[PDB]
Design a protein around this ligand. Structure first.
Ligand SMILES: CC(=O)N[C@@H](Cc1ccc(OCC(=O)O)c(P(=O)(O)O)c1)C(=O)N[C@@H](C)c1ccc(OCC2CCCCC2)c(C(N)=O)c1
Length: 104
């Protein structure tokens, strides 16, 4: 099930541009590999800000010793799919609720 929200090869800059492109809106997101840490991922989400407005925010997805994933140590997940579904249901600390995957 090749997940639409997973962009393997895509830099931090690419993600911001791709997300800010026409067709995407508030809550659009994508998960990419981190540039700082090889083997980890980042969640890039498009949020509506007060000043300039349209901005892209990046969250680090940290790995658990047993194989899980989490953004905040308070809620962990057995995989990326579950992390995406959880934040799609409720922002739960995130800048905004995850909505529709990034469109090209
Ligand atoms: C400059 C910048 O964009 N910083 C990001 C974090 C970040 C992401 C990726 C990379 O490199 C990697 C790359 O490839 O860009 C780096 P870096 O290695 O270049 O420094 C830093 C940020 O502060 N975003 C906010 C929105 C953010 C805000 C709060 C956070 O936790 C608090 C909890 C609160 C409850 C809900 C869950 C979050 C987190 C976070 N966990 O990181 C992130």
């Amino acid at each position: 099930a090749p997940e639409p929200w997973f962009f393997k090869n895509l830099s931090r800059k690419d993600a911001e541009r791709q997300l800010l492109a026409p067709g995407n809106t508030h809550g659009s997101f994508l998960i990419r590999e981190s540039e700082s840490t090889a083997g980890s991922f980042c969640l890039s989400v498009r949020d509506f800000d007060q000043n300039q407005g349209e901005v892209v925010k990046h969250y680090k997805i940290r790995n658990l010793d047993n194989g899980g994933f989490y953004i905040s140590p308070r809620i962990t997940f057995p995989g990326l799919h579950e992390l995406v579904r959880h934040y799609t249901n409720a922002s739960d600390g995130l800048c905004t609720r995850l909505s529709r995957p990034c469109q090209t």
